[PDB]
Design an enzyme around this catalytic site. Sequence first.
Site, PDB file in Angstrom:
ATOM      1  N   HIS A 141       9.364  -1.275  14.516  1.00 31.60           N
ATOM      2  CA  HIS A 141      10.448  -1.218  13.513  1.00 31.60           C
ATOM      3  C   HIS A 141      11.675  -0.910  14.186  1.00 31.60           C
ATOM      4  O   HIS A 141      12.777  -1.313  13.543  1.00 31.60           O
ATOM      5  CB  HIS A 141      10.096   0.080  12.460  1.00 31.60           C
TER       6      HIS A 141
ATOM      7  N   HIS B 103       2.608  -1.460   7.773  1.00 29.07           N
ATOM      8  CA  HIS B 103       4.106  -1.826   7.815  1.00 29.07           C
ATOM      9  C   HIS B 103       4.628  -3.042   8.475  1.00 29.07           C
ATOM     10  O   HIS B 103       3.860  -3.548   9.532  1.00 29.07           O
ATOM     11  CB  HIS B 103       4.885  -0.494   8.161  1.00 29.07           C
TER      12      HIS B 103
ATOM     13  N   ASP C 207      -2.643   2.688  10.104  1.00 25.57           N
ATOM     14  CA  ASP C 207      -2.312   3.046   8.704  1.00 25.57           C
ATOM     15  C   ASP C 207      -2.860   2.045   7.666  1.00 25.57           C
ATOM     16  O   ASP C 207      -2.570   2.434   6.625  1.00 25.57           O
ATOM     17  CB  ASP C 207      -0.754   3.383   8.464  1.00 25.57           C
TER      18      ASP C 207
HETATM   19  N1  LIG Z   1       7.861   5.391   3.500  1.00 25.34           N
HETATM   20  C1  LIG Z   1       9.075   5.329   3.798  1.00 25.34           C
HETATM   21  C2  LIG Z   1       9.360   6.007   5.413  1.00 25.34           C
HETATM   22  C3  LIG Z   1       8.235   5.433   6.365  1.00 25.34           C
HETATM   23  C4  LIG Z   1       8.746   4.564   7.234  1.00 25.34           C
HETATM   24  C5  LIG Z   1       7.787   4.083   8.197  1.00 25.34           C
HETATM   25  C6  LIG Z   1       6.310   4.772   8.206  1.00 25.34           C
HETATM   26  C7  LIG Z   1       5.557   4.112   9.419  1.00 25.34           C
HETATM   27  O1  LIG Z   1       4.310   4.426   9.269  1.00 25.34           O
HETATM   28  C8  LIG Z   1       5.929   3.259  10.470  1.00 25.34           C
HETATM   29  S1  LIG Z   1       4.652   2.633  11.624  1.00 25.34           S
HETATM   30  C9  LIG Z   1       5.999   5.564   7.417  1.00 25.34           C
HETATM   31  C10 LIG Z   1       6.922   5.997   6.378  1.00 25.34           C
HETATM   32  K   LIG Z   2       1.998  -5.280  10.243  1.00 26.41           K
HETATM   33 ZN   LIG Z   3       3.156   1.841   9.909  1.00 24.56          ZN
END
Ligand SMILES: NCCc1ccc(C(=O)CS)cc1
Ligand SMILES: [K+]
Ligand SMILES: [Zn+2]
Length: 613
Positions: free
Chosen positions: A137, A176, A267
């Site tokens: 990210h 994600h 995840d």
């Molecule tokens: N749900 C909003 C905030 C958030 C952002 C990223 C992730 C991940 O798992 C990134 S790998 C999880 C939660």
């Molecule tokens: K992905």
């Molecule tokens: Zn993730």
Amino acid sequence: AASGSALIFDEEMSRYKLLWTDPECEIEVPERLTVSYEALRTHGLAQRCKAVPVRQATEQEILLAHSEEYLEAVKQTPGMNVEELMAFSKKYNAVYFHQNIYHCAKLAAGATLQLVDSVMKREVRNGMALVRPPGHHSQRSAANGFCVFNNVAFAALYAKKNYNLNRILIVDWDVHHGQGIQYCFEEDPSVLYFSWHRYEHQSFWPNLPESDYSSVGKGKGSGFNINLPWNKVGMTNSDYLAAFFHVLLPVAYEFDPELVIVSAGFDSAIGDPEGEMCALPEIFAHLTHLLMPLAAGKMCVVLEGGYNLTSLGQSVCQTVHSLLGDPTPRISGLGTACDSALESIQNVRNVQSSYWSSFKHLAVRTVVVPPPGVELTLPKNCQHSISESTAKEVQRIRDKHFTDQNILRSLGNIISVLDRMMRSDEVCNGCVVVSDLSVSVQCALQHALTEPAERVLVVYVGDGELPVKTNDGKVFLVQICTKETEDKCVNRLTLCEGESLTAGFMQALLGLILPVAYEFNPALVLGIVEERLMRVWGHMTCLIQGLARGRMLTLLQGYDKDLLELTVSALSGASISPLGPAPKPEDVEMMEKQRQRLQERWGLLRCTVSESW
Ligand SMILES: NCCc1ccc(C(=O)CS)cc1
Ligand SMILES: [K+]
Ligand SMILES: [Zn+2]
Ligand SMILES: [K+]
């Protein structure tokens, strides 16, 4: 070539944590590493991998993918206190900082680079890096979604710069969308980025329009960025495997990458509170397996998300099991993907068809039984051949259903191999060269059905009919031939020279053969080759070991040292030489006829939403 797998992990990357109440980041905990590694230690995988130590990524390596200003800002963080860290974190989205997180992020990037170096220097066949923080990210000047530096983008750029690589595949199976990687390579045709991600029609984080299927890359990179959005939760093994079969794998094999890097975010597994999917950890074995024929096995698996500690450990264990060559577990209950997954697959295929023409539409491990007197230098995980009970069974078969001592010996060898594969956990797969295909196939199939094997997948490269009945629901027959056949039985798949031949076969292998095989879930694969197969057979073997826990028995009619060597090498788990980087129109028309004929019974063949009467 290379052997082994690299496991890169250090306790130090578990020495940073969220220091204030933040409901958005409470899941990203140090224990993620701990649990993970301990899982590998409990089942004995960590001890079987080459332990490459971690290092810090240098400043220039970091500047490969980030800007000097953001690097300086992060460099300031180890000197801040809790208020200053909280303010700095508030400057970004869904991320928290800690006095040690700059150190740990340099260590995560450096461990990724260590894995890349280990794989590309032929010191190991593949490997995995248990790292923290994740990376996919983070962007050039921003921390984002628990990520500080982009580890996988680092790996790609580093391989490009230091090994003159022209084609690198990145597979992001985190739940994600790794928008940092997409941003990093959206104009780059040398780095093909595939990602699947929970989207829910842009309502799920990170809520970006460019996470949708219509983002195919900009400029020279158009067609080298493939987003697959899940617009509903609860996606199952069937949805994931259909995504692999009808989107990722054909593009990946046409692309022929020189290196595969996986953003292994777990995840996307069942039980995770953030992804909310229903995929079992075992699927991550097959995913891994399905990618291993690419880039001669050179695969770099890097940890991303995954927050249910139990399913996280289990999925990491499955991935490492596959990386080591251990037999993949049988996946049952597979079927058609859900309507939403089929819509997403259909849309992404349609939009990508202008770049990948396959999408366009019309309006010991192995035992070897060579011929008597033939001796070969078999790989280090192989062995040669008969009991008196085997001879009694052979005499019964002969007196009840069928004079040459050599053919009776071949049948006895077939029976011994089948016993050692099914009844015994000693051998895994086997190859027997044989004369008299009829008698050999009859004996093999009938004895395997009494092993017992609830279901048998026969794969025959040749023409004519074989002594096998597809009437009941216990045998499925794939036949690759040269003559035409109307193909009436719904339990058979007939497939009928030139340079495009190979390009067709892989297509038919990924879009037709593998979906039906996976939904069928056989207890044993029986390969038969009667005599351009040399070009494809290898891949065909390796991928087909995804079924039946690798229990495959190949029968080779006629001695061809090259074919026997390739068969044994693929069955024993050696790496596969790449095919290199367009099928005939009649071939794709025939493939689509077969699909439209069989997809009603075998739902995993569907790559479009079914039309309702
Ligand atoms: N749900 C909003 C905030 C958030 C952002 C990223 C992730 C991940 O798992 C990134 S790998 C999880 C939660
Ligand atoms: K992905
Ligand atoms: Zn993730
Ligand atoms: K790209």
